[PDB]
């Protein structure tokens, strides 16, 4: 149950991540949201899992 | 003093303290209580009226 | 008459922390040169130990609406709730901003709050929101009001962190109530006001009050 | 309650991600709400503990 | 413009039964001082489009109009305004931008001048009445001056 | 007065949205017209 909850949360956040075309356009909101998501989930945690 | 219009601060005459609300402690927010214990404080807050 | 904060006014961002059943008031402070990070200077024992109030003073340089700020970034006014404010450190002339780094070990989602040299970007902009429901967006911020400051760049509250033994300030997702206590609004030309640095000349006799030079026997 | 949190997260996932492309309007709102209520992230991603 | 007229009418109604140095008058003066720049822009708009009808009627303009149809050239309208030395450079630029010049830079000035003359006149009169009321009921105020 | 203040704030936000754009499109015009009719009615009510 715990593993499934955290997997679902990470899936939801990754799906909330902005689109590549928006990021290339450099939209401020998209960059801010991506920064927030990066802050929540470190890369090392994803690699470890 | 008027009903509804006037805003009044309650003060203990003998001690001079002000009727105010205590700081909501944790686990009470968690239970979900909407009741804040009232107390007499030297300074209180700004919205004690 | 209730007084309204206005741009170009000096202010101190103050917060309250209860320690040992004793309320203690702290002011946001930073040095700028040598150390960009912000700390908290107590101002409750002033009647025994004067506080280092020089580095606690911020000027409200600008106050735009969120949309006006968006347009400006894409390219004496009263402070209204929901507007985004820009603060210059009075001494260093740097801007209070939300830093990307985070020295906190207890909190992992919190960032450091410090000073930055330039006013460019959205890190140096903070939105004021009412602490309680008596105030509402579009209202003028009245002196003595409790307000919460949200970083435009990270949607984090200017937060007082008591997690460790010492009291620290950071940008986190937990909110803290701040007071923008005014220091000065506008001085009549040529008149002395508190908090100025100046020289005390003996009458008009080109003699000033001073202490002995550096490395003196009298220990200055 | 991981097992209920998982269902709520699944609903939000379906609400924010459509046809293989993120819906920015819902994604930004969901991210903002989730950060404004950090307890949603679960005990692991809590602030201090 | 109609909504603006209704706002000004509401303000004038607020100034009913006014007294000298009245509280409502003083607060309205404070409001205008706070919104000074926007009021200045509004007044400039109104005075520009009021002077326009006059210049269009002015024979000097009608003379500068050589085209038989009546439509002067965008470069030629620039000349008519240049002659009266009334509108300032940027003002003439704004009038040209609002000119609605045809594909051949042709400006039916009769229509140009008459476009806003009615709503502009109405709101301008109401604003003048408001300012006169405030000036006569708050006699000593440099900010209003 | 409170409703009027809310409407004014909304209209200012919508203007700021359209400030940069050179021209206003048809749906924007319709929304301005709706908001402005409502504001006109509210001003008339206050005058009355």
Swiss-Prot record, chain A:
Q: In which tissues is it expressed?
A: Detected in muscle and myotubes (at protein level). Ubiquitous. Detected in diaphragm, skeletal muscle, esophagus, spleen, submaxillary gland, adrenal gland, cerebellum, brain and in testis germ cells.
Taxonomy, superkingdom: Eukaryota
Subcellular location per the Swiss-Prot or TrEMBL entry: Sarcoplasmic reticulum membrane
What the entry says about post-translational processing? Channel activity is modulated by phosphorylation.
Q: What is the consequence of disrupting this locus?
A: Perinatal lethality, due to severe defects in skeletal muscle development. Neonates do not breathe and do not move. Mutant mice show defects in muscle fiber development. Their muscles do not show a contractile response to electrical stimulation. In addition, mice display abnormal curvature of the spine, thin limbs, and an abnormal rib cage.
Q: What is known of its domains?
A: The calcium release channel activity resides in the C-terminal region while the remaining part of the protein constitutes the 'foot' structure spanning the junctional gap between the sarcoplasmic reticulum (SR) and the T-tubule. Pore opening is mediated via the cytoplasmic calcium-binding domains that mediate a small rotation of the channel-forming transmembrane regions that then leads to channel opening.
Subunit composition?
Homotetramer. Can also form heterotetramers with RYR2. Identified in a complex composed of RYR1, PDE4D, PKA, FKBP1A and protein phosphatase 1 (PP1). Repeated very high-level exercise decreases interaction with PDE4D and protein phosphatase 1 (PP1). Interacts with CALM; CALM with bound calcium inhibits the RYR1 channel activity. Interacts with S100A1. Interacts with FKBP1A; this stabilizes the closed conformation of the channel. Interacts with CACNA1S; interaction with CACNA1S is important for activation of the RYR1 channel. Interacts with CACNB1.
Q: What does this protein do?
A: Cytosolic calcium-activated calcium channel that mediates the release of Ca(2+) from the sarcoplasmic reticulum into the cytosol and thereby plays a key role in triggering muscle contraction following depolarization of T-tubules. Repeated very high-level exercise increases the open probability of the channel and leads to Ca(2+) leaking into the cytoplasm. Can also mediate the release of Ca(2+) from intracellular stores in neurons, and may thereby promote prolonged Ca(2+) signaling in the brain. Required for normal embryonic development of muscle fibers and skeletal muscle.
Q: Which family does it belong to?
A: Belongs to the ryanodine receptor (TC 1.A.3.1) family. RYR1 subfamily.
Task: Tell me what this protein is called.
Answer: Ryanodine receptor 1
Q: Top-down, what is the taxonomic lineage of the species of origin?
A: Eukaryota, Metazoa, Chordata, Craniata, Vertebrata
What gene does the UniProt entry assign to this protein?
Ryr1
Q: Which residues of the parent protein does this chain contain? A: 2422 to 2470 of 5035
Swiss-Prot record, chain E:
Q: Show where the EF-hand domain sits.
A: 59-87
Tell me what PTMs the record reports for this protein: Channel activity is modulated by phosphorylation. Activated by reversible S-nitrosylation. Repeated very high-level exercise increases S-nitrosylation.
Q: In which tissues is it expressed?
A: Detected in muscle and myotubes (at protein level). Ubiquitous. Detected in diaphragm, skeletal muscle, esophagus, spleen, submaxillary gland, adrenal gland, cerebellum, brain and in testis germ cells.
For domains, the record's comment is: The calcium release channel activity resides in the C-terminal region while the remaining part of the protein constitutes the 'foot' structure spanning the junctional gap between the sarcoplasmic reticulum (SR) and the T-tubule. Pore opening is mediated via the cytoplasmic calcium-binding domains that mediate a small rotation of the channel-forming transmembrane regions that then leads to channel opening.
Q: Where in the cell is it found?
A: Sarcoplasmic reticulum membrane
The text of the family note is: Belongs to the ryanodine receptor (TC 1.A.3.1) family. RYR1 subfamily.
Describe the task this protein carries out: Cytosolic calcium-activated calcium channel that mediates the release of Ca(2+) from the sarcoplasmic reticulum into the cytosol and thereby plays a key role in triggering muscle contraction following depolarization of T-tubules. Repeated very high-level exercise increases the open probability of the channel and leads to Ca(2+) leaking into the cytoplasm. Can also mediate the release of Ca(2+) from intracellular stores in neurons, and may thereby promote prolonged Ca(2+) signaling in the brain. Required for normal embryonic development of muscle fibers and skeletal muscle.
Q: How does the annotation summarize its subunit structure?
A: Homotetramer. Can also form heterotetramers with RYR2. Identified in a complex composed of RYR1, PDE4D, PKA, FKBP1A and protein phosphatase 1 (PP1). Repeated very high-level exercise decreases interaction with PDE4D and protein phosphatase 1 (PP1). Interacts with CALM; CALM with bound calcium inhibits the RYR1 channel activity. Interacts with S100A1. Interacts with FKBP1A; this stabilizes the closed conformation of the channel. Interacts with CACNA1S; interaction with CACNA1S is important for activation of the RYR1 channel. Interacts with CACNB1.
Tell me the lineage of the source organism.
Answer: Eukaryota, Metazoa, Chordata, Craniata, Vertebrata
- Provide the protein name: Ryanodine receptor 1
Reported phenotype of the disruption mutant = Perinatal lethality, due to severe defects in skeletal muscle development. Neonates do not breathe and do not move. Mutant mice show defects in muscle fiber development. Their muscles do not show a contractile response to electrical stimulation. In addition, mice display abnormal curvature of the spine, thin limbs, and an abnormal rib cage.
């Amino acid at each position: 149950a715990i593993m499934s909850f955290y997997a679902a949360l990470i899936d939801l956040l990754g799906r909330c991540a902005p689109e590549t075309h928006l990021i290339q356009a450099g939209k401020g909101e998209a960059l801010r949201i991506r920064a927030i998501l990066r802050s929540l989930v470190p890369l090392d945690d994803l690699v470890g899992i | 003093i008027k009903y509804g219009e006037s805003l009044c601060f309650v003060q203990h005459v003998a001690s001079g303290l002000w009727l105010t609300y205590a700081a909501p402690d944790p686990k009470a927010l968690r239970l979900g209580v909407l009741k804040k214990k009232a107390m007499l404080h030297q300074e209180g807050h700004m919205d004690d009226a | 008459e209730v007084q309204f904060l206005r741009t170009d006014d000096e202010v101190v961002l103050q917060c309250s922390a209860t320690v040992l059943k004793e309320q203690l008031k702290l002011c946001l402070a930073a040095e700028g040169f040598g150390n960009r990070l912000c700390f908290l200077e107590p101002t409750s024992n002033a009647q025994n130990v004067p506080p280092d109030l020089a580095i606690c003073c911020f000027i409200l340089e600008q106050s735009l609406s969120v949309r006006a700020l968006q347009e400006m970034l894409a390219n004496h006014r009263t402070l209204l709730y929901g507007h985004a404010i820009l603060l210059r450190h009075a001494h260093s002339r740097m801007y209070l901003s939300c830093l990307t780094t985070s020295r906190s070990m207890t909190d992992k989602l919190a960032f450091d709050v410090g000073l930055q040299e330039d006013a460019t970007g959205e890190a140096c902009w903070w939105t004021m929101h009412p602490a309680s429901k008596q105030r509402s967006e579009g209202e003028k911020v009245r002196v003595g009001d409790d307000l919460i400051l949200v970083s435009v760049s990270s949607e984090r509250y200017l937060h007082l962190s008591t997690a460790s033994g010492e009291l620290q300030v950071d940008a986190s997702f937990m909110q803290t109530l701040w007071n923008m206590n005014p220091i000065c609004s506008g001085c009549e030309e040529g008149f002395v006001t508190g908090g100025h640095v100046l020289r005390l000349f003996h009458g008009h006799m080109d003699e000033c009050l001073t202490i002995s030079p550096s490395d003196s026997d009298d220990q200055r | 309650n991981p097992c209920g949190g998982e269902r709520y997260l699944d609903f939000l996932r379906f609400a924010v991600f459509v046809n293989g492309e993120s819906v920015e309007e819902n994604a930004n709102v969901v991210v903002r709400l989730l950060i404004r209520k950090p307890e949603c992230f679960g005990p692991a991603l809590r602030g201090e503990g | 413009l109609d909504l603006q007229k209704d706002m000004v009418v509401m303000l004038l109604s607020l100034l009913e039964g006014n007294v000298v140095n009245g509280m409502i008058a003083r607060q309205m003066v404070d409001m205008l001082v706070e919104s000074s720049s926007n009021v200045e822009m509004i007044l400039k708009f109104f005075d520009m489009f009021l002077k326009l009808k006059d210049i269009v009627g002015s024979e000097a303009f009608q003379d500068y109009v050589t085209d038989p149809r009546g439509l002067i050239s965008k470069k030629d309208f620039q000349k008519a305004m240049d002659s009266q030395k009334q509108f300032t450079g940027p003002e003439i630029q704004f009038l040209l931008s609002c000119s609605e010049a045809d594909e051949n830079e042709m400006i039916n000035c009769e229509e140009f001048a008459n476009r806003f003359q009615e709503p502009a006149r109405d709101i301008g009169f109401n604003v003048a009445v408001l300012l006169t009321n405030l000036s006569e009921h708050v006699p000593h105020d440099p900010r209003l001056r | 007065v409170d409703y009027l203040l809310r409407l004014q704030e909304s209209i200012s936000d919508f203007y700021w949205y359209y400030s940069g754009k050179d021209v206003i499109e048809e749906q924007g015009k319709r929304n301005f017209s709706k908001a402005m009719s409502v504001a006109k009615q509210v001003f008339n009510s206050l005058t009355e």
